[PDB]
């Protein structure tokens, strides 16, 4: 499968080199190859998979937003022909393909083999995120279903995280941050977004006293993102 002939450990090593070189497309292709070896991923390997695809899809989303804004201004205007729409559609189809690829890795077979809370929550958060990126560009018959798929993945991850992880766990925090962004941006539920961000921040605050200095730094960095959104939204 392009990477089928490369050793798992060599794909992991090359994904780390690609990260250092800021070659995120290559990094994602190496990590897809590693997942397709069929073994579960370690904590560090899950992080490499997520960093790779978030950077690839992040560049696509930024480009889609530039193009979408030009297309909307063109629809306010001298008719420039079909090119702005065509090129926005090109970038959109590419973005959808990357999201479908990640969702396919999660469904075949990362989630079903993930039994520990840390891995299962991590993958379900990714599933919510990539359906959220699909929802950002969705306009047709399936838009509500894409939004519900994001909601359902985030909700399952939240339910496990609240039962199995402390309120300062960084994955639990990042999940709550992203589900709160889903509520605000995608589900048109700003009050739910604000409530979730506040409750997550406050419950983490109350558990910081249990942490080492390094864990404190990890948790407080994500708490600051929650507070930055609360400042933006209130």
């Amino acid at each position: 499968g392009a990477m089928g002939s490369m050793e798992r450990a060599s794909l992991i090593q090359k994904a780390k080199l690609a990260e250092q070189a800021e070659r995120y497309e290559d990094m994602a292709a190496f990590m897809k190859g590693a997942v397709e070896k069929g073994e579960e991923l370690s904590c560090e390997e899950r992080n490499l998979l997520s960093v790779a695809y978030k950077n690839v899809v992040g560049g696509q989303r930024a480009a889609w937003r530039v193009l979408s804004s030009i297309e909307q201004k063109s629809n306010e205007s001298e008719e420039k022909g079909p090119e702005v729409r065509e090129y926005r559609e090109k970038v959109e189809t590419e973005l959808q393909g990357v999201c479908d690829t990640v969702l396919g890795l999660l469904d075949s077979h990362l989630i079903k083999e993930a039994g520990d809370a840390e891995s299962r929550v991590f993958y379900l958060k990714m599933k919510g995120d990539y359906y959220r990126y699909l929802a950002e560009v969705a306009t047709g018959d399936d838009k509500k279903r894409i939004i519900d798929s994001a909601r359902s993945a985030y909700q399952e991850a939240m339910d496990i995280s609240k039962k199995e992880m402390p309120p300062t766990n960084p994955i639990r925090l990042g999940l709550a941050l992203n589900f709160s962004v889903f509520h605000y941006e995608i589900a048109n539920s700003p009050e739910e977004a604000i409530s979730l961000a506040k409750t997550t921040f406050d419950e983490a605050m109350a558990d910081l006293h249990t942490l080492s200095e390094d864990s404190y730094k990890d948790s407080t960095l994500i708490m600051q993102l929650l507070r930055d959104n609360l400042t933006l939204w209130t």
Binding site: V51, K54, E185, N229, W233
Partner: peptide, 9 residues
């Protein structure tokens, strides 16, 4: 105006 989702330090 766009909010922060999780990102690397």
């Amino acid at each position: 105006r766009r909010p922060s989702s999780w990102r690397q330090e």
